[PDB]
């Protein structure tokens, strides 16, 4: 792995310091339907004319990004994404900007959110949950080795490709950091104590988020929830948890080691690294190289209703994509 990782660090850095920009134009894409929405902008299922391929295009309004004080995060997530490369990470195929917005055209993952599937099925068996955890454990091992902290792990942020494999794609809260950072960001249920308590936190949080994910996947509901954030934060800082009776002892002991309020005790954060996790009884069954290789059989496989079928997808108000006749926020995004 170290051998693999050191060769990737090298790949990462080359792109990280000499990124890429203006790899395509908007005139060469046919918008199909909105798939996501928010303060950032909006992700859209698109079709490449000359090729006919389907891509997920994220459109950001420049003036708005400025207004909301999001120019650093906006350049950071696009910088991180054109530089990472892992089997479970969504590649960014193209990226340009015009007199109005910034565009990030990624690989379209058609199986949608793991969230949709989890709320429908109820809960996930441990082997099914584990299948996914395994893919997350690897993607953090990687990301972390590049001194990148993820901090935005949650079902709604995890997609399932056609082979039934997990795909991470949103790097808005990602931070290039070797030591500690302080910002408060994430989703209440996935926040680690230390992020709540206004403490300097490291990459260990991403490991807390995993124990949470593995818990919500096997149980169907998060380890700490409540009516409002504040009461959750409260639940969390107590690090007091109860497990569904069906949970295996092994799945329980792994979670007691992941959801550990004592940082000096958190797995993936101890002295032996991720191997404390990779080597946990719960993962005995896991074939780490086959998972990497994608040689393992998904326990669930979306069966698309054709290329770019978006029927099992919620709808959104389609807004026109306007582009100003005059430049907008030039200087602030010259790095895009």
């Amino acid at each position: 792995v170290k051998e693999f990782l050191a060769k990737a660090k090298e790949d990462f850095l080359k792109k990280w310091e000499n990124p890429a920009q203006n790899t395509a134009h908007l005139d060469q894409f046919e918008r199909i339907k909105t798939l996501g929405t928010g303060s950032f902008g909006r992700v859209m299922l698109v079709k490449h004319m000359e090729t006919g391929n389907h891509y997920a295009m994220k459109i950001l309004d420049k003036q708005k990004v400025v207004k909301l004080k999001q120019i650093e995060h906006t350049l950071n997530e696009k910088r991180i994404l054109q530089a990472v490369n892992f089997p479970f990470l969504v590649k960014l195929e193209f990226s340009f900007k015009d007199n109005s917005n910034l565009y990030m055209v990624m690989e379209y993952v058609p199986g949608g959110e793991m969230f949709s599937h989890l709320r429908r099925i109820g809960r996930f068996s441990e082997p099914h949950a584990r299948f996914y955890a395994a893919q997350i454990v690897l993607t953090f091992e990687y990301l972390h080795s590049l001194d990148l902290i993820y901090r935005d792990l949650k079902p709604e942020n995890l997609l399932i490709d056609q082979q039934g494999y997990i795909q991470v794609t949103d790097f808005g809260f990602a931070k290039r950091v070797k030591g500690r950072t302080w910002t408060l960001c994430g989703t209440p249920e996935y926040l680690a104590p230390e992020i709540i308590l206004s403490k300097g936190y490291n990459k260990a949080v991403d490991w807390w988020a995993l124990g949470v994910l593995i818990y919500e996947m096997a149980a169907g509901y998060p380890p700490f929830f409540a009516d409002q954030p504040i009461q959750i934060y409260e639940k969390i800082v107590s690090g007091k948890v109860r497990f569904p009776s069906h949970f295996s002892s092994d799945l329980k002991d792994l979670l007691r080691n992941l959801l550990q309020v004592d940082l000096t005790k958190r797995f993936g954060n101890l002295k032996n690294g991720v191997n404390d996790i990779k080597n946990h009884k719960w993962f005995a069954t896991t074939d780490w190289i086959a998972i990497y290789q994608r040689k393992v059989e998904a326990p669930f496989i979306p069966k698309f209703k054709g290329p770019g079928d978006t029927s099992n997808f919620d709808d959104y108000e389609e807004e026109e994509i306007r582009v100003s006749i005059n430049e907008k926020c030039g200087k602030e995004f010259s790095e895009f």
Partner: peptide, 17 residues
């Protein structure tokens, strides 16, 4: 029950950051 409390919490849909 926990599943029961979960529903009552109202945080059973997509959560924002």
């Amino acid at each position: 029950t926990t599943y029961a409390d979960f529903i009552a919490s109202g945080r059973t849909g997509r959560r924002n950051a």
